[PDB]
Amino acid sequence: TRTLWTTPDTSPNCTIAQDKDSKLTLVLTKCGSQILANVSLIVVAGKYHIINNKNNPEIKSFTIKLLFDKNGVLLDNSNLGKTYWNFRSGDSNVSTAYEKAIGFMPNLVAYPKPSNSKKYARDIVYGTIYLGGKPDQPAVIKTTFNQETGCEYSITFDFSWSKTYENVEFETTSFTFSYIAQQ
Amino acid sequence: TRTLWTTPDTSPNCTIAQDKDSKLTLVLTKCGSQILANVSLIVVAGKYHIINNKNNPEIKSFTIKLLFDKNGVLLDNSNLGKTYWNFRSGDSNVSTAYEKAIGFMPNLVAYPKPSNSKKYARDIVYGTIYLGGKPDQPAVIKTTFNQETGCEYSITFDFSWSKTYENVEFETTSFTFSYIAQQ
Amino acid sequence: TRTLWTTPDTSPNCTIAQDKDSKLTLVLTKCGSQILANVSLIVVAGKYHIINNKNNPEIKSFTIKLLFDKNGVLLDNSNLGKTYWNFRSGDSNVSTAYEKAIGFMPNLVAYPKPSNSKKYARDIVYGTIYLGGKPDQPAVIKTTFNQETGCEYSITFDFSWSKTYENVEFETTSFTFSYIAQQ
Secondary structure (H helix, E strand, C coil): XCEEEECCCCCCCECCCCCCCEEECCEEEEECCEEEEEECEEECCCCCCEEECCCCCCCCEEEEEEEECCCCCECCCCCECCCCEEECECCECCCCCCCCCCCCCECCCCCCCCCCCCCCHHHEECCEEEHHHCCCCEEEEEEEECCCCCCCEEEEEEEECCCCCEEEECECCCEEEEEEECC | XCEEEECCCCCCCECCCCCCCEEECCEEEEECCEEEEEECEEECCCCCCEEECCCCCCCCEEEEEEEECCCCCECCCCCECCCCEEECECCECCCCCCCCCCCCCECCCCCCCCCCCCCCHHHEECCEEEHHHCCCCEEEEEEEECCCCCCCEEEEEEEECCCCCEEEECECCCEEEEEEECC | XCEEEECCCCCCCECCCCCCCEEECCEEEEECCEEEEEECEEECCCCCCEEECCCCCCCCEEEEEEEECCCCCECCCCCECCCCEEECECCEECCCCCCCCCCCCECCCCCCCCCCCCCCHHHEECCEEEHHHCCCCEEEEEEEECCCCCCCEEEEEEEECCCCCEEEECECCCEEEEEEECC
């Protein structure tokens, strides 16, 4: 499978700025032609952990890329660690190894490659999450489909602020969206 | 079925202002009592294609109506073209229009018809999409259930901008919501 | 089952400020590891029915708590009435009470208890609903998971305004979100 996730375990699984500096809590759940997605992010390390824009005003956005082969396995030059990401059983993920989740991938027809044809804005799903769950502390999470090259399919999360933040931990609220499946 | 959609093909399928001037990319996917919906809009023609509010400040909202008989077939005086809209098999629809679509329709109990009784606002699901996928360029998408007359069921999208736009193509981001099913 | 709901009937089922003063229209629908949730609120009685902030500027937020035992039955010191809340069969509920809908519950792993650790903000799902479906009249709906004590699981809705409202009926638009299931 119903579900292809990174375990909810919060053992860091994502490399933004330095090795295993973050936990991306992505959960994809197939309902026929739509994948239902729930996403969250805890930076625990280095750049992007604590934000001081009085210090570093240049720092106010970053990116996490998920790339996939013709089959839909995570290509290990994705920001996300390949081991934790696999179809879920219970509190774990069937262990074994991931293979053949096509149609967990976003539809190429619906969400074309940049090369294949002129892209429209339906490729994108803007959402807003909140740092520390504080209403005064929002940030944007622009999810973008099959727009990376060096892969057959992409999901790519772009995080951005626009507010000058002084000592704010980048741990987000949950956000939910859907996209159209390849099959 | 799982899914009732307009093909993602982007061959114009919707009549807002003039014949086939737009592509409504609606995708309904039944999860028991809830329909999970993903919606997008590309205007390609005439009024509402390029927005100049310096020229036409009066122009900042329009409407797309989906009407359904007792059975849940699109009544062909809906803004959406009746041919492209049918239960999905592959990237097409078996290309013979459906007969038994009910319970893709929004619940009359939950979302009543405009009776004498006190009407509550739970009929409505406000969302925000973004023109050209630009954060500076938002617009509203008020989805409204079973409030149109001359039909048994309605889904109706109301698009509005508070913002004075100078030469902006009305092509939207994806937006996802859910409603309660009739059956 | 697919669905665990409060009937869509407008018969008050929730106690905010005084006995049965409100109708919470909560609808949980299991798609594997994610619950897809649709929520609405009609206050019909007493404090929080009509809002005058010229009169009572102190009044601009309130809370509805859903509590669950190890098994996932609503504990009857929840704001929501235990009788109307049960797995859906037609537009009714088989009128025989459920025990142990676990995995309609939010995951403890994902959404931990306030257990003496660093708590992260992924517990929370901020949304905005609109009073009377009027764009000028928004309110916030901070949904928060497993953060209440005297229970094994919690869903808790926090409603807040920040705008001075003069004679506004607190009846909301629908709002849709998802959380990760326990199992």
